[PDB]
Each structure stands twice: as structure tokens, then as C-alpha cells.
């Protein structure tokens, strides 16, 4: 169905029990090393701080970090690569009490402990070398 | 004027005296590290070999390489960064006898010696985190 704009920006609120659901596909083959980035921002401004930075180099690695008062903190690097060459992916990011949990196509794949309270989030941006068909933030919980 | 599709693909031929002219802008601020990539390919297929790979991490560095029978060769890394935060750029890549020369906004900025004859080029792709308003390959010379 219909392609969403990329870069994709949605005003957002997160707390324990929130889920962020993303369906998309890499624009090109893994040999060409397309990226995916998901940033949970503290303001609508793109230069604002990032509570949770998630950056996939498809076929190679994933880095997670925070950007706090304009400065990148301690990088976490994973070689875990559940994404499949040439395939649509479904990404879901759950806000648990102590961490973000990243599911890829239904499989727990990455976690990242909260450095800043999730309530600081005001915006989610999804960008780099993908098409997007679906984006949702859940708002069911108190 | 009118935005070209990104990723941008044009069938191309190059030889000594050819110029490739690119006008675009980074989609986001340099703090968010948008990329630009220009690949001179040996076939229309995106998985084909790359005679000249040019990859800008805006505000940080540039890497140049070739991908030959599916394998990346010796990386050349530059910290030269003439690109200006938030600005439109004009990139021109001249095919000289012994190298590619990269001009940024009229300023000689990078060169890369031919590893494969430029006549092997059949396609140029321009992609990653930019908008494009202009792309030209010159065809004036014998
Ligand atoms: O300069 C190093 C920093 O650069 C940024 O682009 C992110 O990749 C961070 O994860 C990293 O710590
Ligand atoms: O694996 C290392 C290689 O990876 C590719 O993505 C390019 O960046 C090459 O310049 C580099 O040599």
C-alpha cells in the first residue's frame, strides 16, 4: 500500500507499555550497505537530543546510542543481523520498564537500557535508505 | 526547480573529458550526519562492480574506493569537508587522463586515480540522504 514520506517525522509520546511499529524495506541490495535509522527525539527540531538512536547498516552491524545536550554518549555495537537481503521488515520497539526492546519480524533482536526517561520523547524520526508503508505509536495505556 | 528521484539512476558512458554535474542538498542538519553517495557502476544492475565509489558523511569525512568482482579494494579516507551545513551544493566530477577530480561549489576537493578504465562505466547512481535538482553527464568529446 501507500508509501509514507522518508525522512518520516511524527510527534510522539512514550511511556512503559508504548509500542512503535515500523513496516518498510531497504531501497537497495545489502551489497550496497543501505542504512536504516530510528531516532527518539526530545523536541520536534531534528537537531534536538536523542533518547534512543538505532542505526542499522544492513548486512553488517547495528549501533545504538544517545545524544545528550548535543553530544553522543557511549556507543553500543551489535553484529546481530536478523534483517534479510531484499525483504520487507517489520520492526517493533517496546518501551519496557528498564529498556527499549527491538523485535525484527517477530524476533527479539536488540535491547537498550533507558539513559533518559521515555517521557522526555516528543518526536520519532525514521530515515536513511528505506521505503515505509506503516508507522504506529500505541497510546492504549495510562 | 523539480526534485529528481532519489535513489537516482542514469545509464552513462565516461571517457577523458567527461564531466558529471550534480546539484542537490542534504535532507537534514550535519549534526544528524546525513550521507551522500555517488557510484560509477560497470552495469545497470545495482549489485554490479563500482569503478569509483564516493561516500560523504556530511560534516565528518569522505571515503573513496572501488568494488571489483564483488569485493571492496583499498579505502582512501579524507577529512577535507568543503560542504556547508544546511546549504545546496554543486558537485562536478571530471574524468582526467589519470584520475577523477571532484569539485565542490567550484573548489577542487578530492581526486582518485583510475583503477579501472572509465570506459567500463555503464551507469551512475546518486543516493542516500539528499534531494537532487540537477544531474548531467557531458557527451561533447570524441
Ligand atoms: O563520533 C562517534 C559517534 O558518532 C555518531 O554518528 C554515532 O554513530 C555515535 O554512536 C558515535 O559514538
Ligand atoms: O568493509 C570495508 C569496506 O566497506 C565498504 O562499505 C566501503 O566503505 C569500503 O570503502 C570499505 O573498504
UniProtKB/Swiss-Prot annotation, chains A, B:
Keywords: Acetylation, Cytoplasm, Lectin
Annotated Gene Ontology cellular component terms: collagen-containing extracellular matrix; cytosol
Domain Galectin: 6-138
Annotated site (Not glycosylated): 136
Keyword Cytoplasm: yes
Annotated positions of the N-acetylserine modification: 2
Listed PROSITE patterns: GALECTIN
Other noteworthy facts: Forms hexagonal bipyramidal crystals, known as Charcot-Leyden crystals, in tissues and secretions from sites of eosinophil-associated inflammation and some myeloid leukemias.
Quaternary data: Interacts with CEL.
Protein known as: Galectin-10
Organism: Homo sapiens (Human)
